[PDB]
Amino acid sequence: FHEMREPRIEKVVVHMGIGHANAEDILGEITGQMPVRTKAKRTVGEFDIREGDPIGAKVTLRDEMAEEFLQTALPLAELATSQFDDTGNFSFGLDVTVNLVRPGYRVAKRDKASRSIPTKHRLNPADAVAFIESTYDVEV
RNA sequence: GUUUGACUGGGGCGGUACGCGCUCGAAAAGAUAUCGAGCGCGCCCUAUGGCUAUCUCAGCCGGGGACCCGGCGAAG
Numbered sequence: 001f002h003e004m005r006e007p008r009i010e011k012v013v014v015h016m017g018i019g020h021a022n023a024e025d026i027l028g029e030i031t032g033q034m035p036v037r038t039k040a041k042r043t044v045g046e047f048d049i050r051e052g053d054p055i056g057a058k059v060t061l062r063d064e065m066a067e068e069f070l071q072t073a074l075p076l077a078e079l080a081t082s083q084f085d086d087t088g089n090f091s092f093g094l095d096v097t098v099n100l101v102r103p104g105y106r107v108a109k110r111d112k113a114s115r116s117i118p119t120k121h122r123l124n125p126a127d128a129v130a131f132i133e134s135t136y137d138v139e140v
Numbered sequence: 141g142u143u144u145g146a147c148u149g150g151g152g153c154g155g156u157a158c159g160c161g162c163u164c165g166a167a168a169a170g171a172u173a174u175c176g177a178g179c180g181c182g183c184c185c186u187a188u189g190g191c192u193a194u195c196u197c198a199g200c201c202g203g204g205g206a207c208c209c210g211g212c213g214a215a216g
């Protein structure tokens with residue numbers, strides 16, 4: 001029961017919300033894989049009337065790439081309980097978002113007979129802090 | 141030598157109910173008038189057309205009014 005209940009990292013999303021790009025290059029080095037362009041929506045007074053146009057870049061790491069990054073990434077932050085989502089997620093900062101979830105999360109990500117994960121199988125800030133804190137660092 | 145139209149609570153003036161589209165008037169099939177009420181069309185678009193693949197929107201909440209992550213969300 002506990003085996004299919006113990007949390008895990010689904011994805012590590014590192015992104016730099018600029019506002020006009022050239023920054024892609026560093027993310028590629030700090031993470032290990034190709035970054036992606038970020039387009040914006042709606043016209044913006046702040047000389048941002050152009051809808052589809054580069055404004056940021058992100059990277060979604062999964063599995064090793066995720067941990068190998070967090071290893072030398074988490075030590076760079078001072079995690080606090082507040083910095084945690086209601087789903088058991090947390091982000092710090094260049095931004096670093098960590099998406100944590102239980103074993104059969106795919107049930108809500110597959111094409112056929114997908115289903116929303118029950119509030120019971122959903123992760124919690126509490127169960128989140130633990131898992132993480134239970135690995136190279138401290139909470140609050 | 142002729143023309144100088146029609147509608148109209150008489151006519152003139154004003155207006156166009158003079159060709160079209162929608163709601164209501166309209167009385168739960170259809171049809172239905174007044175110078176009845178609300179208001180539009182005489183285009184625009186080579187994509188703002190067509191198909192396919194991938195995908196889900198407003199709005200609100202939580203975590204780092206532009207961006208990133210998560211949740212709620214049959215449709216506003």
Ligand SMILES: [Mg+2]
Nearest residue numbers: 141142143144
């Ligand atoms: Mg004669």
Ligand SMILES: [Mg+2]
Nearest residue numbers: 146147148151
């Ligand atoms: Mg007359």
Ligand SMILES: [Mg+2]
Nearest residue numbers: 166169170171
């Ligand atoms: Mg009828």
Ligand code: NA
Nearest residue numbers: 037038053054
């Ligand atoms: Na782009």
Ligand code: NA
Nearest residue numbers: 143144145146
């Ligand atoms: Na005439």
Ligand code: NA
Nearest residue numbers: 153154155175
């Ligand atoms: Na009159």
Ligand SMILES: [Sr+2]
Nearest residue numbers: 149150151152
């Ligand atoms: Sr009179």
